[PDB]
């Protein structure tokens, strides 16, 4: 259960806030403790859960989640499809 | 933290070239739907 607001901004009312500043009780290195810590999320990555304005990551009811290693790359590099022998 | 202004993600293409290349697809399309035909372009109908 995130507790989110809008990002520090002075935009016209028409322009909706797409960057929600969310604070949440996160886990610690030790099972014993916890930690309230904040992060920023896009409006599409969260859903209003329900006078607090509290949200959740949208995957929480559809699927589980796994953080891609930053030590990886998404760049599309050229592949060749080679045949076996006698093909 | 976001360092600096809060702006909007976007993409730019040349209106000139898009005009040019959308003209090419139309020249080709009329080979399948008739020489005396209107072929306009519209945005997505709806979905995910």
């Amino acid at each position: 259960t995130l507790q989110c607001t809008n990002v520090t901004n002075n935009i016209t009312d028409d322009m909706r806030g797409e960057l929600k500043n969310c604070s949440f009780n996160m886990t610690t290195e030790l099972r014993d403790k916890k930690q309230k810590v904040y992060s920023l999320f896009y409006r599409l990555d969260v859903v209003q859960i329900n006078s607090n304005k509290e949200y959740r990551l949208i995957n929480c009811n559809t699927s589980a989640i796994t953080q891609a290693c930053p030590k990886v790359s998404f760049e599309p590099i050229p592949i060749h499809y080679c045949a076996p022998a006698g093909f | 933290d976001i360092i600096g202004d809060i702006r909007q993600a976007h993409c730019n293409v040349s209106k000139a070239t898009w005009n040019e290349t959308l003209g090419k697809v139309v020249k080709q399309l009329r080979k399948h739907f008739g020489n005396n035909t209107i072929i306009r372009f519209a945005n997505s109908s709806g979905g995910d």
Partner: antibody, heavy 132, light 108 residues
Framework: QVHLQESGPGLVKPSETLSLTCNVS????????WSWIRQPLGKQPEWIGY???????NYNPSLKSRVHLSLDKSKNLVSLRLTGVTAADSAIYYC??????????????????????????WGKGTSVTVSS | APTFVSVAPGQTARITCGEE??????VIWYQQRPGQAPSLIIY??????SGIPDRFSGSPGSTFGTTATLTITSVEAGDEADYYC????????????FGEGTTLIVLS
């Protein structure tokens, strides 16, 4: 040639209607955008509000309802009306032409900019006391 | 609370005003000559109109996490006065009261 001169009563009782006027010279009211600034004793100045023809007349939110700016086309002088006057309102008031501008940091169509005005020419001043 | 800046004649003084920067800003600067009215000295972050010569340098609005500075160069007796700044941050709302003053006082 262009020059300004403010005037007022000089003294107001608590909870009354403050009223001020500013003589103009050289250029006229329709041509430019007008603004007021008050400055209490030994403190930084507080921007009161701005005024122009066509309804471009938004005010200081901290002053809220009690302030009403206005104009006088024929007589060619800037006007001001403040209600519910108190000790906090004791200051030397100023009239000034405000000059607008545009500061752009992103795409204009995305509306990623803001309107910023400064006030280039002031008057002499308007000493306004408020005591019973 | 009342802040002061002091330098020798012919030197270059430096004066800061207002909150630390968030987004790109336009900052207006003024000079209250004791007795007289506030005088607009800089309108853009470093633009000066007629009547005010160089160099009244200033912080450009292009920086973030930075303070707003006003650099007086080659100071003289006349330059002694109170100063104020007006801030316009793309992120923060309209500042309806000039930032706190910073009074300059040359030496000797």
């Amino acid at each position: 040639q262009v020059h300004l001169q403010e005037s007022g009563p000089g003294l107001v009782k608590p909870s009354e209607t403050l009223s001020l006027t500013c003589n103009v010279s050289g250029t006229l009211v329709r041509d430019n955008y007008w603004s007021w600034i008050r400055q209490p004793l030994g403190k930084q100045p507080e921007w009161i509000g701005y005024v122009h023809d066509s309804g471009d007349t938004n005010y200081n939110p901290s002053l809220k309802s009690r302030v009403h700016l206005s104009l006088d086309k024929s007589k060619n002088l800037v006007s001001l009306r403040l209600t519910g006057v108190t000790a906090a309102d004791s200051a030397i008031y100023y009239c000034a032409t405000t000059k607008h501008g545009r500061r752009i940091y992103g795409v204009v169509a995305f509306k990623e900019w803001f309107t910023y005005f400064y006030m280039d020419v002031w008057g002499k001043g308007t000493s306004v006391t408020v005591s019973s | 609370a009342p802040t002061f800046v002091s330098v020798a004649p012919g030197q270059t003084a430096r004066i800061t005003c207002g909150e630390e920067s968030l987004g790109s800003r336009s900052v207006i600067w003024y000079q209250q000559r004791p007795g007289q009215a506030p005088s607009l000295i800089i309108y853009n972050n470093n633009d000066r109109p007629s009547g005010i010569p160089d160099r009244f340098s200033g912080s450009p609005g292009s920086t973030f996490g930075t303070t707003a500075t006003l650099t007086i160069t080659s100071v003289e007796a006349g330059d002694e006065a109170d100063y104020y700044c007006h801030i316009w941050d793309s992120r923060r709302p309209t500042n309806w009261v000039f930032g706190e003053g910073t009074t300059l006082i040359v030496l000797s």
